[PDB]
Amino acid sequence: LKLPTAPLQLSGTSAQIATLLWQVAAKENQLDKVQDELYQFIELFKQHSELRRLATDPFVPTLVRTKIISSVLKDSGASEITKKLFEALADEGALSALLEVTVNYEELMLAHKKEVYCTVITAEPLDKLERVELTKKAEKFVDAGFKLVMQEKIDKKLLGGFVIEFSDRRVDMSTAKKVEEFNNFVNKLVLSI
């Protein structure tokens, strides 16, 4: 009908369930609620064996699975979105699609907030001036008002500088790489001149 536009487009049959779940939850403005219920369901399948038996065992009938998922999800602040979603995934035997629908829901939510998770690998631990002059250098690697979520790391094999890891792209602004590409260029010149 009239659903909100998804923040970023995705692949098929496990991410389309997440895009539909996101558009329904943004139509109800329960975006942080059903993400929390999805995390609670990940932990639920982590905790008990009888619950993941309804997702892995092929000999449980559909009637048992849909009636257990209906009867155990009657109340307790679970939204109509999550309860109808688990009815819809239990009706089809597709309860195994939860672990792959939550990561696409997470990517959808991490795109509606205009954020970006990153990893800064520095040779030494950072100060409160060695960090503040880094993020203004790191914010030119996003193309909009994306606020990076700083993640610091340590690696002594860098000789100072920083490496950014955006999980999509990697900027090697280190010195140990700079003295590597210095020697390659100076050796590729002396073999010419």
Partner: peptide
Amino acid sequence: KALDELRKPKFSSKYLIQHVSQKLIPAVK
């Protein structure tokens, strides 16, 4: 780690999106 059983989704149908949209669009109030 028992979550490794749920790593790959086992889809018994291809048009599952139509069934879950028949059940998630009526979840809107």
